Amino acid sequence: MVLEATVLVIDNSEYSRNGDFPRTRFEAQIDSVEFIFQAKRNSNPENTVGLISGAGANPRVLSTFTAEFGKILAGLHDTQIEGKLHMATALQIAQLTLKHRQNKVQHQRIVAFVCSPISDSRDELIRLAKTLKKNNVAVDIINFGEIEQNTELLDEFIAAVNNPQEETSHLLTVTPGPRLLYENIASSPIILEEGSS
Amino acid sequence: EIDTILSTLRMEADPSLHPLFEQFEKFYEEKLWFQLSESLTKFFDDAKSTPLRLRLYDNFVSKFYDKINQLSVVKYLLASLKDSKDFDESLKYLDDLKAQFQELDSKKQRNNGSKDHGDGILLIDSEIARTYLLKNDLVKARDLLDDLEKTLDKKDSIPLRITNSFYSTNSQYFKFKNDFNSFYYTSLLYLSTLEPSTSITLAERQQLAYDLSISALLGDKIYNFGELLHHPIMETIVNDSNYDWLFQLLNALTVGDFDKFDSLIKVQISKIPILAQHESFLRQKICLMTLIETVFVKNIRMLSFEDISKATHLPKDNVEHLVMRAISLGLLKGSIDQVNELVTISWVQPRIISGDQITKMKDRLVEWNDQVEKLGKKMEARGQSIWV
Amino acid sequence: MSLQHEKVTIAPLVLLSALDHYERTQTKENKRCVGVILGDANSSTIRVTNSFALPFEEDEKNSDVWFLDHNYIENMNEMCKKINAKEKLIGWYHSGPKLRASDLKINELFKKYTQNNPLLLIVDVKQQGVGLPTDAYVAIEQVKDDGTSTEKTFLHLPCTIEAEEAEEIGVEHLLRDVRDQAAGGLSIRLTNQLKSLKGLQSK
């Protein structure tokens, strides 16, 4: 997607600690933010990306929209490693951040890392799913947390969001064993994502 | 390699805790260090007093310090070493982990971004001081406690746990000395910042509560008899055998009944020889309590000596001693006129405000509302000409 | 951090700024405007000298959900110091109406930037009554005798107003009233005695 403003959600939960992905899953995501940043920029040099956390009780703004990978990276150094994901507040704040744009043309996209099963209720996520498609904002889920012990709740939410429409949602489920986290996202659609209209 | 150590724990362990040991290793295998953490916590509740906890747990922590968050590890190592009988073992294992940390933070801070390594330091220092109290090296334990206090309080946003350990150490020191005054206030703080974890055994929780009550009887300025009952520490267990005679003495003091104090005291002074050696302190508290109560609720700020004498069941000779003792303690301030036989109070020390009393305040204020109001009317009316 | 927050003296310019900026950032109907307050501290008496608006977008539904552009605050700040480098970030104005316990979280953000505890100066813009439309509150974390395992809280602080020489002369040039807080002649003070009684009564 040419012309895109992306909010990344970094989860810094007690499940990112765990050594599941090389070296640790927590340290893997650092590499993953840098790789994503360069992929997006080379697609269309006028794209930008920002980084919010979902971790902690209250999502904390690290970095707003920037074309610069070091800034985002500086922001990654501030982190709480005892936070707990709270998706419901993260999505809502994320949209807001996206409504201010350098140019109005750039689409509204969330790519969110999800490392822990979503503690919020099923009923909440049903309301959230239709809140998102209403304002033309789609959410692309990097999953490898919820598969661990819980059924893919996230799938029903993605299906409602996806309609024939330029904005398309996807559920991307990542081989959980070693194969390098950044590599899986690399061999998946990330800018080869097509429309649905 | 650690498989074999597990086999050893399994054997000596009860069959009930036998499935636990296999699961611990399973979580470790998979490298689910979230589950690994939790499994440990549970183990230690009821198996802290079996020699398997420290051993197995210790080994696990040593072979997985980095793997689990640092805070978890450090709480484990203290628990094992509370239960040691050797003070020499405890001292050594603690100085090794502190040492390790110094190297650890160089790496970690850059690898994570932000990992807090300061937690572990203060927790260690508190337990090291606690080891020393045991060997009666009471002078050392003191000055390490001072050093820490200054440090801790400069650290701006403190976690609850750190100052909670600081407070256990502190109290203890003072009750070796058996100064009641010193023990009591500090103890109240320990309880307030007390971990919501129920990992601290009910037996330990009551035992400490007991101590506060004994100090408070034998003190000289403590009137928090009501405060204890409004705090959880006593609030939740009120049925125990110990909590008969004991609560009853406290309610005896509050209402200033000397007949109720007398009857109890005959029995109790025998049971506990502490109260025998502080017989004089215990006798005084009932009297002090009663004079201040009467002065508070009475709205007039002068009271004749005759009222106090009959109220307190003491001769009139003893009234002059008691008012004098009181002004000196600073419980009350005022003056003694022997030629009007009045004692004029001019200051009363803050007190709890019981339910009944909340109602009283409202009454005094309702009356004062009407005074303001009636006055304002006349003055509104007269001198109408000019208000500009 | 700084415990030192014994008194709050407040510039009338701050007020004035908080009232005006509210409309030129164009927020109405309980949509909060958050801006920075600049002035001195590490001093017993805290003196709030001046202020500047930040953009602030607040979600209608909840007060746990909000947008604040962090990066803006640092960029604004450095130009502002060139003007006057005495001034330091000391906290934030909240455009009323009235305290929330959602502020506790908000305060914490500002604390990152500041080397002192951020002051929450609630400048109420609705000007209810003729009494001061400032309450001041500071986030303090304290222990409490009830049993509570450390409480985090906002404690009321005394608010007064002081103005500079430059500022004071501006206040008097503007005013054209006869005045009646003068407490001057027999007439003003005659009123003032009655006024105080009823003042008390209401309270």
PDB file of C-alpha atoms in Angstrom, chain B residues 36-152:
ATOM      1  CA  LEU B  36       7.618 -21.181  34.948  1.00  0.00           C
ATOM      2  CA  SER B  37       7.456 -18.154  37.154  1.00  0.00           C
ATOM      3  CA  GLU B  38       3.957 -18.845  38.392  1.00  0.00           C
ATOM      4  CA  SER B  39       4.530 -22.465  39.143  1.00  0.00           C
ATOM      5  CA  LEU B  40       7.364 -21.557  41.610  1.00  0.00           C
ATOM      6  CA  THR B  41       5.248 -19.095  43.556  1.00  0.00           C
ATOM      7  CA  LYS B  42       2.654 -21.747  44.413  1.00  0.00           C
ATOM      8  CA  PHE B  43       5.201 -24.333  45.497  1.00  0.00           C
ATOM      9  CA  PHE B  44       6.763 -22.168  48.088  1.00  0.00           C
ATOM     10  CA  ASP B  45       3.486 -21.523  50.091  1.00  0.00           C
ATOM     11  CA  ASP B  46       3.279 -24.713  51.925  1.00  0.00           C
ATOM     12  CA  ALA B  47       6.667 -26.287  51.150  1.00  0.00           C
ATOM     13  CA  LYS B  48       8.816 -23.446  52.613  1.00  0.00           C
ATOM     14  CA  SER B  49       9.119 -25.386  55.866  1.00  0.00           C
ATOM     15  CA  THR B  50      10.203 -28.685  53.884  1.00  0.00           C
ATOM     16  CA  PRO B  51      13.942 -28.673  52.919  1.00  0.00           C
ATOM     17  CA  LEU B  52      13.001 -29.182  49.295  1.00  0.00           C
ATOM     18  CA  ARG B  53      11.877 -25.603  48.592  1.00  0.00           C
ATOM     19  CA  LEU B  54      15.159 -23.716  49.042  1.00  0.00           C
ATOM     20  CA  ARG B  55      17.169 -26.544  47.481  1.00  0.00           C
ATOM     21  CA  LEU B  56      15.107 -27.186  44.350  1.00  0.00           C
ATOM     22  CA  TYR B  57      13.853 -23.602  44.115  1.00  0.00           C
ATOM     23  CA  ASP B  58      17.347 -22.226  44.717  1.00  0.00           C
ATOM     24  CA  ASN B  59      18.870 -24.396  41.990  1.00  0.00           C
ATOM     25  CA  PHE B  60      16.105 -23.447  39.557  1.00  0.00           C
ATOM     26  CA  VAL B  61      16.612 -19.731  40.196  1.00  0.00           C
ATOM     27  CA  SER B  62      20.381 -20.088  39.811  1.00  0.00           C
ATOM     28  CA  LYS B  63      19.963 -21.902  36.490  1.00  0.00           C
ATOM     29  CA  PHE B  64      17.243 -19.497  35.340  1.00  0.00           C
ATOM     30  CA  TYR B  65      17.873 -16.079  36.833  1.00  0.00           C
ATOM     31  CA  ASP B  66      17.890 -14.228  33.615  1.00  0.00           C
ATOM     32  CA  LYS B  67      15.067 -16.253  32.237  1.00  0.00           C
ATOM     33  CA  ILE B  68      12.492 -15.193  34.831  1.00  0.00           C
ATOM     34  CA  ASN B  69      12.179 -11.444  35.815  1.00  0.00           C
ATOM     35  CA  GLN B  70      14.679 -10.337  38.438  1.00  0.00           C
ATOM     36  CA  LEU B  71      12.121  -9.390  41.037  1.00  0.00           C
ATOM     37  CA  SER B  72      10.679 -12.884  41.141  1.00  0.00           C
ATOM     38  CA  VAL B  73      14.132 -14.480  41.738  1.00  0.00           C
ATOM     39  CA  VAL B  74      15.104 -12.201  44.577  1.00  0.00           C
ATOM     40  CA  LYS B  75      11.854 -12.791  46.562  1.00  0.00           C
ATOM     41  CA  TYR B  76      12.592 -16.552  46.247  1.00  0.00           C
ATOM     42  CA  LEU B  77      16.138 -16.298  47.622  1.00  0.00           C
ATOM     43  CA  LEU B  78      14.943 -14.335  50.730  1.00  0.00           C
ATOM     44  CA  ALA B  79      12.172 -16.926  51.485  1.00  0.00           C
ATOM     45  CA  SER B  80      14.674 -19.798  51.502  1.00  0.00           C
ATOM     46  CA  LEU B  81      17.034 -17.898  53.746  1.00  0.00           C
ATOM     47  CA  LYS B  82      14.345 -16.867  56.304  1.00  0.00           C
ATOM     48  CA  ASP B  83      13.978 -20.560  56.825  1.00  0.00           C
ATOM     49  CA  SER B  84      17.733 -21.277  57.098  1.00  0.00           C
ATOM     50  CA  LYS B  85      19.007 -21.689  60.684  1.00  0.00           C
ATOM     51  CA  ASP B  86      22.459 -20.726  59.663  1.00  0.00           C
ATOM     52  CA  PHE B  87      23.042 -16.987  59.490  1.00  0.00           C
ATOM     53  CA  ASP B  88      26.396 -17.767  57.828  1.00  0.00           C
ATOM     54  CA  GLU B  89      24.727 -19.385  54.794  1.00  0.00           C
ATOM     55  CA  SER B  90      22.390 -16.481  54.391  1.00  0.00           C
ATOM     56  CA  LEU B  91      25.021 -13.789  54.394  1.00  0.00           C
ATOM     57  CA  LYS B  92      27.110 -15.486  51.717  1.00  0.00           C
ATOM     58  CA  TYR B  93      24.400 -16.342  49.201  1.00  0.00           C
ATOM     59  CA  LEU B  94      23.071 -12.731  49.343  1.00  0.00           C
ATOM     60  CA  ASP B  95      26.410 -10.952  48.741  1.00  0.00           C
ATOM     61  CA  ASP B  96      26.935 -13.281  45.672  1.00  0.00           C
ATOM     62  CA  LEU B  97      23.663 -12.253  43.951  1.00  0.00           C
ATOM     63  CA  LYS B  98      24.256  -8.532  44.597  1.00  0.00           C
ATOM     64  CA  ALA B  99      27.694  -8.893  43.088  1.00  0.00           C
ATOM     65  CA  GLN B 100      26.325 -10.568  39.994  1.00  0.00           C
ATOM     66  CA  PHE B 101      23.863  -7.738  39.332  1.00  0.00           C
ATOM     67  CA  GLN B 102      26.546  -5.167  39.081  1.00  0.00           C
ATOM     68  CA  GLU B 103      27.856  -6.906  35.870  1.00  0.00           C
ATOM     69  CA  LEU B 104      24.330  -7.783  34.706  1.00  0.00           C
ATOM     70  CA  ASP B 105      23.091  -4.245  34.202  1.00  0.00           C
ATOM     71  CA  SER B 106      25.792  -3.356  31.634  1.00  0.00           C
ATOM     72  CA  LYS B 107      24.460  -5.937  29.229  1.00  0.00           C
ATOM     73  CA  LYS B 108      20.827  -5.889  30.011  1.00  0.00           C
ATOM     74  CA  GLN B 109      20.076  -2.292  29.715  1.00  0.00           C
ATOM     75  CA  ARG B 110      21.111  -2.207  26.108  1.00  0.00           C
ATOM     76  CA  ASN B 111      19.646  -5.604  25.146  1.00  0.00           C
ATOM     77  CA  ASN B 112      16.025  -4.819  26.545  1.00  0.00           C
ATOM     78  CA  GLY B 113      16.094  -1.079  26.327  1.00  0.00           C
ATOM     79  CA  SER B 114      14.960  -0.688  29.852  1.00  0.00           C
ATOM     80  CA  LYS B 115      15.329  -3.324  32.520  1.00  0.00           C
ATOM     81  CA  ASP B 116      15.327  -2.200  36.093  1.00  0.00           C
ATOM     82  CA  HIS B 117      18.156  -3.670  38.084  1.00  0.00           C
ATOM     83  CA  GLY B 118      17.815  -1.511  41.098  1.00  0.00           C
ATOM     84  CA  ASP B 119      15.105  -3.514  42.662  1.00  0.00           C
ATOM     85  CA  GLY B 120      17.164  -6.309  43.641  1.00  0.00           C
ATOM     86  CA  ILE B 121      19.849  -4.282  45.403  1.00  0.00           C
ATOM     87  CA  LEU B 122      17.552  -2.701  48.023  1.00  0.00           C
ATOM     88  CA  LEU B 123      15.760  -6.015  48.780  1.00  0.00           C
ATOM     89  CA  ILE B 124      19.061  -7.736  49.400  1.00  0.00           C
ATOM     90  CA  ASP B 125      20.260  -4.983  51.768  1.00  0.00           C
ATOM     91  CA  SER B 126      17.203  -5.214  53.885  1.00  0.00           C
ATOM     92  CA  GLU B 127      17.567  -9.028  54.381  1.00  0.00           C
ATOM     93  CA  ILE B 128      21.333  -8.759  55.169  1.00  0.00           C
ATOM     94  CA  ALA B 129      20.431  -6.440  58.062  1.00  0.00           C
ATOM     95  CA  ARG B 130      17.826  -8.976  59.112  1.00  0.00           C
ATOM     96  CA  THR B 131      20.434 -11.760  59.244  1.00  0.00           C
ATOM     97  CA  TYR B 132      22.489  -9.642  61.702  1.00  0.00           C
ATOM     98  CA  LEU B 133      19.711  -9.145  64.222  1.00  0.00           C
ATOM     99  CA  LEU B 134      19.784 -12.887  64.809  1.00  0.00           C
ATOM    100  CA  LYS B 135      23.401 -12.981  65.898  1.00  0.00           C
ATOM    101  CA  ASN B 136      22.683  -9.996  68.229  1.00  0.00           C
ATOM    102  CA  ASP B 137      25.038  -7.723  66.231  1.00  0.00           C
ATOM    103  CA  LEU B 138      22.431  -5.162  66.890  1.00  0.00           C
ATOM    104  CA  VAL B 139      24.816  -2.267  66.491  1.00  0.00           C
ATOM    105  CA  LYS B 140      25.729  -3.261  62.769  1.00  0.00           C
ATOM    106  CA  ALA B 141      22.063  -3.901  61.799  1.00  0.00           C
ATOM    107  CA  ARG B 142      21.273  -0.478  62.947  1.00  0.00           C
ATOM    108  CA  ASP B 143      23.746   1.499  60.865  1.00  0.00           C
ATOM    109  CA  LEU B 144      23.007  -0.450  57.611  1.00  0.00           C
ATOM    110  CA  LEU B 145      19.324   0.385  58.163  1.00  0.00           C
ATOM    111  CA  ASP B 146      20.165   4.121  58.457  1.00  0.00           C
ATOM    112  CA  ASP B 147      22.257   3.945  55.268  1.00  0.00           C
ATOM    113  CA  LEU B 148      19.418   2.375  53.407  1.00  0.00           C
ATOM    114  CA  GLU B 149      16.750   4.830  54.687  1.00  0.00           C
ATOM    115  CA  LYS B 150      18.402   7.772  53.282  1.00  0.00           C
ATOM    116  CA  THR B 151      18.990   5.967  49.913  1.00  0.00           C
ATOM    117  CA  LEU B 152      15.402   4.628  49.528  1.00  0.00           C
TER     118      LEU B 152
END
